[model samples]
Target: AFDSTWKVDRSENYDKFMEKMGVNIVKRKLAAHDNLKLTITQEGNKFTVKESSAFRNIEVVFELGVTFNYNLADGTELRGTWSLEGNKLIGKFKRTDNGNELNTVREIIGDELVQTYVYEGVEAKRIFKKD
Candidate 1:
């Protein structure tokens, strides 16, 4: 049950990942301290996720294996699908502007939830804990 309010604990290589995504240095520095929180609810093959960060607050609802449009706080657009693979949630997305792939994965380990993002050859991890 990925139904909980989680607060970001820390990140690994996220700045580099954002850099690869073309985020400027000032925004990247601000994003490093964005303090993101997520409220995720899963029902069958559907999910509702509420995301809050220093930049904005938004909600995203989608079904597993279905494509949907998503945007970053900086207004970058992506089209993607999220699917469950065993205990992990896998996301495969492509940039709307350039068509480059951005792959992501989410899993819960112990008392923390780990989300990983990969764009180009750069990979980043954002770890969270129940709040």
Candidate 2:
């Protein structure tokens, strides 16, 4: 049920969140329209995600019940784990630099994939569709 090809449709305050992460304003602006797309496949407790964006294209493979180290585009490292909580694919991550916690959730709404993120006191959303 978690298999899909999704394209970035819109964002909410993601640019500002990137700026808060220390990215420059121009970089944030360009990232806002980064032509993001994702190809995801899930098999039981295993999943793989192939992501393409204006910034970079990469493939990430992880198991649902395992923790892994993930690096941000800005080189911030995070230690995280992904799991399923009912119908949601949930992820809990922590920034290695300052020990700040960040959480992400993915859900299907109509024909779109809505991804929500929360860090510190800021919450943001990014929605996608099958491309």
Candidate 3:
């Protein structure tokens, strides 16, 4: 139910979310990757995903309901967990940079893929479709 190559369709108040994140510009209008291809596949209980923006195969492999951590040099480090609940995957991540709770959800319903985001009490939604 959660396997697909998802491409972003439209977003709701995403620019404000980025605005609160200290992003400069009309750059928020561009959003880097509207045509993102976040490919997800389940091989056994271990799930692997890839972002097409990388040349190194930009892949991440993890198990469901496990704690995971990743860091970037840009001062955004997070400890996150993905858990399966109902027909949804709840993405809970806390940023160590500012210690803010950034919550997200990924739910697949038919041909539609949805992700809802919240941080600093900001609410936003991103919609995508399977290609």
Report the number of the highest-lDDT candidate: 1
Ranking by TM-score: 1, 2, 3
What are the per-residue Cα lDDT tens digits for candidate 3 across 1-63? 778787777778777786766555554556544334468786777667664432123465567
Which pairs clash inside model 2? none
Greater-lDDT candidate between 1 and 2 = 1
Tens digits of lDDT, candidate 1, 44-123: 77778686889788786777777887788887787778877787788877886876999988887877888999997778
Question: Candidate 3 has what TM-score?
Answer: 0.78
- TM-score, one value per model: 0.90, 0.85, 0.78
Q: Please write out the lDDT profile of model 2 over residues 29-104, one tens digit for every residue.
A: 7886776667888776677867678877767677777787777565567777777667668887788787788887
Model 1 spans > 4 angstroms off? none
Residue 7 lDDT, candidate 2, scale 0-100: 90
Residue 70's lDDT within candidate 1 is: 76
The residue ranges of model 3 lying beyond 4 angstroms of the native Cα positions read 26-35, 51-58, 71-75
Ranking by lDDT: 1, 2, 3
Whole-model Cα lDDT of every candidate shown, in order: 0.82, 0.76, 0.69
Which structure is stronger by lDDT: 2 or 3?
Answer: 2
lDDT of 2: 0.76
